Design an enzyme around this catalytic site. Structure first.
Site, mmCIF file in Angstrom:
data_model
loop_
_atom_site.group_PDB
_atom_site.id
_atom_site.type_symbol
_atom_site.label_atom_id
_atom_site.label_comp_id
_atom_site.label_asym_id
_atom_site.label_seq_id
_atom_site.Cartn_x
_atom_site.Cartn_y
_atom_site.Cartn_z
ATOM 1 C CG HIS A 1 -1.919 -1.146 1.164
ATOM 2 N ND1 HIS A 1 -2.822 -1.295 2.202
ATOM 3 C CD2 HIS A 1 -2.137 -2.186 0.326
ATOM 4 C CE1 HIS A 1 -3.579 -2.352 1.923
ATOM 5 N NE2 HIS A 1 -3.160 -2.921 0.840
ATOM 6 C CG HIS B 1 -7.453 -3.077 2.943
ATOM 7 N ND1 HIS B 1 -7.592 -3.215 4.296
ATOM 8 C CD2 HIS B 1 -6.690 -4.107 2.531
ATOM 9 C CE1 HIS B 1 -6.986 -4.332 4.659
ATOM 10 N NE2 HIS B 1 -6.394 -4.849 3.639
#
Ligand SMILES: Cc1cc2nc3c(=O)[nH]c(=O)nc-3n(C[C@H](O)[C@H](O)[C@H](O)COP(=O)(O)OP(=O)(O)OC[C@H]3O[C@@H](n4cnc5c(N)ncnc54)[C@H](O)[C@@H]3O)c2cc1C
Ligand SMILES: *[C@@H]1O[C@H](CO)[C@@H](O)[C@H](O)[C@H]1NC(C)=O
Ligand SMILES: *[C@@H]1O[C@H](CO)[C@@H](O)[C@H](O)[C@H]1NC(C)=O
Ligand SMILES: *[C@@H]1O[C@H](CO)[C@@H](O)[C@H](O)[C@H]1NC(C)=O
Ligand SMILES: *[C@@H]1O[C@H](CO)[C@@H](O)[C@H](O)[C@H]1NC(C)=O
Ligand SMILES: *[C@@H]1O[C@H](CO)[C@@H](O)[C@H](O)[C@H]1NC(C)=O
Ligand SMILES: *[C@@H]1O[C@H](CO)[C@@H](O)[C@H](O)[C@H]1NC(C)=O
Ligand SMILES: *[C@@H]1O[C@H](CO)[C@@H](O)[C@H](O)[C@H]1NC(C)=O
Ligand SMILES: CC1(C)OCc2cc(C=O)ccc2O1
EC number: 4.1.2.10
Length: 510
Positions: free
Chosen positions: A451, A489
């Protein structure tokens, strides 16, 4: 929310090989990178204006293992031949990693977890967001490609475990990044079909949107300094030019790695650095390729004595200082590149639970620098400086302690090899959990959460409208733009962001 349905490739009717010279000419908008932000941005702009989307990779139908949950492992196991949807890299920290090279970007290779940004994020940025429109834009994405996942036995175990370990409250099914345990959305549907950012091209106007694939954008062209266009090469190595016209704009959506790389190659970046490579400076900015972040992933692997059903991640345990999930994974004899931080990691002989914690922020940062001063196909250098900031290390210690508490729950007790009192009753693949021993474990066993973000920050490279400071007709919209995660996320935030900024551009111009 979306229904179960086949992946919608209707948009292929306006997807062309970059070898087609008739794509060269003037557009209202050029978007560089058909990824998470790029696709919904190009689709949104196409409602009113003539748009060219340039993607370096090919179309997902070339790589069918991109289109199902059970294909996820295959794309990470596949050797990188320069054409595959997974591009492999190793950070200068020594940590294996991957980025996408495909129309739809990282939404075509990712783990499908969907969440909205922490609702505190907007006011933390100090950007004047239209919050009603942000929420309308989330629903536009979610109605296209997000489902409520069906129950999966391992995710239900882990969720019971998080709750028993004190990750409260129980939020049930929710898309919101909030403290506690929840079932979140997924971009895999209930049939295991992957939905992705490329399907948001189906929302574009087919009379106004053109997509060139295997289009490797090598340079931003400049004129009151204005971006005017791009140079891109095709799969045969021939060069092509496209331009914007009138009040139109070039938007860079090439990702945390690709955006800063193209800015640097185009002469936008630190003066002393570019001058040191004999790259002519178009726009000096000391922060292009600076403030690049990778949230740490720390983990244990348990090997239950009876098989567990493989699952896609849907159940999240959220605290301010750590974000936790677990996948149940089938055994393999070919490693999934970057699942473990190096190629020297044991292979699993049976089903295992990968039990994970993510450090928020993170506060540690590094940079992207050019490996080649001319060739965009040569990956840039990237370094993240994992755990250089002691706050990050402190937060990993807290998360690893909470994974300790999770392994001690009644929920997980049935997955032990030995009915002993302690977590040494589990069988582990790799390093088991052991403050100093937790610090060593954090430093030594860190992996990428995938990420990564930064390199073209709002407040450093960009203004609050995502414009490159000092240049007209140039914006950046992708994960290069923020120094902290919006949530655990981020694909949900970056899909929303492409359309949202698309709408701000159309409003600004109306
Ligand atoms: C393996 C993996 C699993 C993940 N799992 C999840 C998860 O489950 N949920 C979640 O929320 N997040 C997840 N993420 C993170 C999330 O998917 C990404 O942070 C996000 O998709 C990044 O979006 P982007 O638009 O910045 O980049 P991308 O989606 O990568 O888009 C950039 C595009 O630019 C193209 N490109 C680059 N340079 C050029 C150039 N010079 N010319 C032309 N095209 C170019 C690339 O090929 C690419 O398609 C995961 C990431 C990975 C790698
Ligand atoms: C583009 O055309 C070339 C031949 O000129 C071929 O090698 C290549 O595979 C084509 N790419 C796509 C995405 O169709
Ligand atoms: C936006 O949606 C969230 C739920 O994701 C909600 O908490 C918030 O109140 C909404 N905000 C506005 C401005 O409508
Ligand atoms: C999902 O199914 C599991 C069975 O393992 C059950 O325990 C759990 O309560 C279910 N969750 C919901 C919200 O129905
Ligand atoms: C830049 O060019 C100058 C010649 O003008 C040369 O002296 C110097 O070595 C060059 N530096 C690089 C890194 O190419
Ligand atoms: C949400 O973001 C805010 C502000 O940045 C922060 O105070 C809070 O800890 C975050 N919440 C969670 C659960 O991550
Ligand atoms: C290019 O990359 C390799 C490793 O990826 C590195 O070792 C090499 O020195 C790099 N070159 C430059 C000029 O940065
Ligand atoms: C960690 O990050 C913060 C900036 O967010 C900074 O104040 C501090 O100096 C950093 N700590 C270390 C140990 O470098
Ligand atoms: C939890 C995380 C990081 O994400 C999803 C995932 C999927 C597989 C598939 O085989 C393996 C491991 C894995 O790990």
């Amino acid at each position: 929310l979306a229904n179960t349905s086949a992946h919608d490739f209707s948009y292929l009717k306006f997807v062309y090989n970059a070898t087609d010279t008739s794509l060269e000419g003037s557009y209202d908008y050029i978007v560089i990178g058909g990824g998470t932000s790029g696709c919904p941005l190009a689709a949104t702009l196409s409602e009113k204006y003539k748009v060219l989307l340039l993607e370096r990779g090919t179309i997902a139908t070339e790589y069918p293992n991109t289109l199902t949950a059970d294909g996820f492992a295959y794309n990470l196991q596949q050797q990188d031949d320069g054409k595959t949807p997974v591009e492999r890299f190793v950070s200068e920290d020594g940590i294996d990693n991957v980025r996408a090279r495909i129309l739809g970007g990282t939404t075509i290779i990712n783990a499908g977890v969907y969440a909205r940004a922490n609702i505190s994020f907007y006011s933390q940025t100090g950007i004047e967001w239209d919050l009603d429109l942000v929420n309308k834009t989330y629903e536009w994405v979610e109605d296209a490609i997000v489902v409520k996942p069906n129950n999966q036995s391992w995710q239900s175990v882990i969720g019971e475990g998080f709750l028993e370990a004190g990750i409260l409250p129980d939020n049930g099914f929710s898309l919101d990044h909030e403290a506690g345990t929840r079932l979140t959305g997924s971009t895999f549907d209930n049939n295991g079909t992957r939905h992705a950012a490329d399907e948001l091209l189906n929302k574009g106007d087919p009379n106004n949107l053109l997509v060139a694939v295997q289009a490797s954008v090598e340079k931003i062209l400049f004129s009151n300094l204005s971006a005017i266009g791009v140079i891109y090469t095709d799969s045969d190595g021939n060069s092509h030019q496209a331009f914007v016209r009138g009040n139109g704009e070039v938007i860079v959506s090439a990702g945390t790695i690709g955006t800063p790389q193209l800015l640097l190659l185009s002469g936008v970046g630190p003066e002393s650095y570019l001058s040191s490579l004999n790259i002519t400076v178009v726009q000096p900015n000391p922060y292009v390729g600076q403030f690049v972040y990778d949230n740490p992933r720390n983990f244990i692997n348990i090997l239950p004595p009876n098989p567990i059903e493989a699952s896609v991640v849907t159940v999240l345990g959220i605290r301010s200082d750590y974000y936790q999930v677990s996948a149940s994974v089938l055994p393999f004899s070919t490693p999934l590149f970057s699942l473990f931080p190096t190629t020297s990691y044991p292979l699993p002989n049976s089903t295992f639970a990968h039990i994970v914690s993510q450090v928020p922020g993170p506060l540690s940062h590094g940079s992207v620098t050019l490996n080649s001063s001319s060739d965009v196909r040569i990956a840039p250098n990237i370094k993240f400086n994992y755990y250089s900031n002691s706050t990050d290390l402190a937060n990993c210690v807290s998360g690893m302690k909470k994974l300790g508490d999770l392994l001690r729950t009644k929920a997980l007790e049935p997955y032990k090899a030995r009915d002993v009192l302690g977590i040494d009753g589990f069988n582990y693949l790799g390093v088991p959990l052991p403050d100093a021993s937790f610090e060593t474990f954090c430093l030594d066993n860190v992996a990428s959460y995938w990420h990564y973000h930064g390199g073209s920050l709002v407040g450093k490279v960009l203004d609050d409208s995502f414009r490159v400071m000092g240049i007209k007709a140039l914006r950046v919209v992708d994960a290069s733009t923020f120094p902290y995660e919006p949530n655990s996320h981020p694909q949900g935030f970056y899909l929303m962001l492409g359309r949202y900024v698309g709408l701000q551009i159309l409003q600004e111009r109306s």
